[PDB]
């Protein structure tokens, strides 16, 4: 057979930068892919250089009447001191929930075994699962036995 | 004439752990440090051989 | 003068996807083609005790962008980025593989996934055990330059290519051309 | 801490043989959260002086295991001691020599009952007496857990054995 | 179900927030590589 | 388990290895290489002196200087402990390396794997 | 037997935390180190003529 | 494990074990060196028939 | 055995307070030569003593350079004990670290090695020096067995499963690999 | 054997890594934790380049008996398949054993005149190029 | 737990804790006639309305807890059959 | 294959020994200390 | 015949203002093999300097500065029954403790190996690069 080494054309024209970390997005397209166990490639795909910020950076989202967590996942204030994975990310705030009344979690112990695998991302061209996207470990206070 | 020779060598090694020693800022034993302090700056085969 | 030749090669590759019990069915394939009933029941109990969430339906991931700073703009840009990701390394770029092999793209390298009981560089050797009908199927070509948004329609025009139907296999299934509505910068960034 | 009267004139020789654990009434974490995964537990009794050599067979993930223990005598006929945080007091109060056996175990100020039988099925009168005793032992009916009636291990191997003794 | 205020994961939400306002294929490419292209809506979990 | 030949002893062998793990193999570096990596700082003079002393020690107490039979030089006594024959004191082609010659710089050897030339 | 005193120790107890069972031993200052390498092997041979 | 015994033994001279900075440490050390040198050559199989 | 003459006496040391001399080993016992009980090393008493770190802190008798943040911390860094002495009004946290056991075998890793005799020399590294650091690695040998008859609970080696890493050790990197290779070659002629 | 389930559930406690997705070390150094982030990252990238050039493992002498050279510090050991003993594995109980070809060290880059690397297979790839 | 948040006193509606009906949630799901897979959950099968109504199965002494959404529960288990046989011979 | 592992994409906590060693790293290009760092902690880390 | 040989000493670099030291190094040219003479000396040299140049050695921290490790741990992780600021510099002078799990969940099986650095060029494992400590869902 005839081996084929990769050969990419020049990168696409320059783009704008507005993330306060100005870096010209210069993407390229590999016009010829490798085959028959040849050389995969030599050069990197992306190239980030100096850029002139023109548009203003987007400010953070408004956390209105919501208890802010260590990450920033703003949820309703009713979840404070619920005796469970309220924020579902970390237990930073915790509302100093020492006296947890109203029977937290109603003695429900075990969740589904690996529901995180179903909640995890999925790729179609590779057939391999990806990272978790939907946080199913949360409960919202409504215990469903 | 008949000759038969066999070498049935079976070597088995089970790696319990793989350790790596640090390279910088190594704290030596007090005895070795004393011995190093007891070495003169002039070349002396006896003390160095003892060490 | 008498000469006799004996040659018999039997190989098995069980796939038991029961975390610990998965290896039992794979190891039991040595000299035992038929699966053990008790071992099969144990593996079934293990699979009951541990889910296999694979084989489920999918949805566009970019739809989950609901409440974030610049939510709609980020969702539209993720739409465009997913389109570019899908068409930048689509299997159309790779050359067709021999013996009906399926090609994939891992970075900047094509890989001809060979059918079972086959091997080789481009799935050419080991055609002893096919167990299939045979032939050469059709493969969709890479999408051409997108439409210039004359009236909003699309101009993909996916047509046949260098792997035509030759061995009597079925042609590439799907639409020949596509039609949509140009976003017009997504309604000038949402009104 | 409680103490009752053991079986009158308990004979370890006539008590030897193969026993089958049927029901256990107590309040333990493994019994209440992991009680649904209980399996068939059989017992082997062998006299050794005043003490009692004890072997236990149970299916763990399919593979059987042999738990060998030695119930040390407490100086009183009927009561025994076993050592591992805690002290175990084995007390046999009501039992015959042919059909059933009831054992009492104490650990960390907590009482527990164990029902043993020579073979299946278990007589309804024996189960009624066991229920009456476990109710008189300040234990509720919900704390009773039934075990499967099949899947008992024949014998373990040298590699799969316990050495508590 | 898909349509709701589904509680997103901390890394997912963080990477979605770190995306620049202006169109930049660089960050979105790494995001699509790390997280994939689709998420599950419904279906059984039968083994193979 | 050494005299044993069955896999029944492998479980107890692994258990003993868990309790008392022996050292199978290990990488090594000269003793004067660790003095440079001390908190005391520069020790170039002492390091070179100890390096020369070690170079002389590896020659005065070399395995060749010991009596030919595996020759093991320990202190002032020469032993091989056998030649697997158990015939005589040393348990008597064979092959034997000659010792390193004096620094000329040249350095000669004679009989054979290994190097026979060294330069100071 | 021992020609010297092997019980005296200089300062802070140097731990010898090793062995088959869970027990802590001491190492005297007279001895540099005492490892617990529990090696074991055997040999065999046969001769005929 | 209850009562072991020696298998391998590293060698070391006694005159090297003499305490330093004693009354006559050096001369007594050299004297014991000469004494052991004469001892190991005084009587042995080499001198017998 | 042939031994050279005694070398000249070196200069006396104030702290060592001893003299030193040595000789070279010319020819050992090759086949049947008379062995030499005499060694190549010697020492001598001396009475010519004259005068006997600079960092934050230093041990009294040993020249171990220690920082002041390790003084009065509930851990003996000097063999003499000059770091935990007179610490009257000083709180000493337990760190929940001295309760766990160090890695078994640090003694052999702290010993020297001689390629000539393949034997173990004296201690080179300090196997008991922590320097206030508390690193714990998931033990691999805490997996023997654990049973509970009263609750019919059979579980794993969860009791006392932690190995404290003795500053001088970079990492222990627990791992496991067992490769049994049998090389059998039966020949018949 | 029949204890495959025991090996499987023991691996659940102490598993071994097979597939790895690597990420350079200078990306792990963040600006919020260390000052001079840009200079540190540039120096780390240059050091990684020099290291990859140094430990490329091609500078070791070619082994024999289809061995695979392995670089470790200053020593180089040859990993040989079953059937060969001794250093460099020149002794074996087999005739005309097929020796697999190995690639040599890639040449240095040209000064912006068109970067190309050369290498001789004395089955590794070669003829790598980078635009200036 | 909004109703039972800070109740100073409660009236025991059921004397003993009973187990729920197994697979009772399958009869609360919605049914999409077009899709052939019925639907996700729409009705709640854990709510009981306070009344501790139960039913005793055959040789299943431990009582089951009937939800409030189920008006009538009956245990009439009975099997209901296909058989195929083919044989060909050639000589 | 027993378990799937994935490191957080950003905002991770660094080890204290590596923290101190990076704080000890110089600013001027010195291949010695960087090579020692590569020999002590490797060339990459584990993301997946 | 192929004994180890290191290149010549590199040119002296400028004295680092922050590290108050100058550095020089050498790189390997030929590896030793067949029990040859290795390169049994340091591949780098360090010397003391007298640098007068303002350096930004110390880094700022918003949260509480840990007493032993010097970590920028937020106050939300203090007095929670967890060991966050290092060995024991956290949990100091705490009135009450909370926010800890009751079942005392252990760490992931084998997570220690997945937190250490790896050498992709030699496939060897190295020291820990990530902090896989406890820090509860
Ligand atoms: C369904 O429930 C009804 C309730 O009366 C019962 O009569 C019937 O036997 C059950 N089973 C069926 C209809 O298959």
Kindly describe this structure.
It is classed as immune system. The entry lists the keywords C5b9, immune system. The entry is titled "Closed conformation of the Membrane Attack Complex". Chains A, C, E are Complement component C7. This is part of a larger assembly, with 3 copies of chain A, 3 copies of chain B, 1 copy of chain D (165 residues), 2 copies of chain G (49 residues), 3 copies of chain J and 1 copy of chain K (91 residues). Chain A contains 1 helix and 2 strands. With 145 residues, chain A is largely without helices or strands. In chain A, strands 1-2 form a two-stranded antiparallel sheet. In chain A, a hairpin with a 6-residue loop joins strand 1 and strand 2. The termini of chain A are far apart. The N and C termini of chain B lie far apart (60 Å). Helices cover 27% and strands 27% of the residues of chain B. The longest helix of chain B is centred in the middle third of the chain and has 8 residues, at 30-37. With 49 residues, chain G is mostly loops. 2-acetamido-2-deoxy-beta-D-glucopyranose is lined by residues 72, 74, 76 of chain K.
- Work out the helicity level of chain K: under 10%
In N-to-C order, the SSE pattern of chain K is EEE
**Largest sheet data of chain B:** none
Tell me how many strands of chain B there are: 3
Entry keywords:
part of a larger assembly, 13 chains, B: 51 residues, alpha+beta, 2 helices, 3 strands, elongated, K: 91 residues, mainly beta, 13% strand, binds 2-acetamido-2-deoxy-beta-D-glucopyranose, Complement component C8 beta chain (chain L)
What is shown here, in short?
Chain D is mainly beta. Chain D has helices at residues 12-15, 29-33, 124-136, and strands spanning 17-25, 41-48, 51-60, 63-73, 79-82, 88-95, 100-107, 110-117, 144-146. Chain K has a 3-stranded mixed β-sheet with strand order 1-3-2, with no helix packed on it.
Summarize the topology.
The structure is cut from a larger assembly and holds 3 copies of chain A, 3 copies of chain B, 1 copy of chain D (165 residues), 2 copies of chain G (49 residues), 3 copies of chain J and 1 copy of chain K (91 residues).
Chain A: H1 115-119, E1 120-122, E2 129-132
Antiparallel strand pairs in A: 1-2
Chain B: E1 4-6, E2 9-17, E3 20-21, H1 30-37, H2 45-50
Chain G: no helix or strand
PDB class: immune system
Keywords: C5b9, immune system
Entry title: Closed conformation of the Membrane Attack Complex
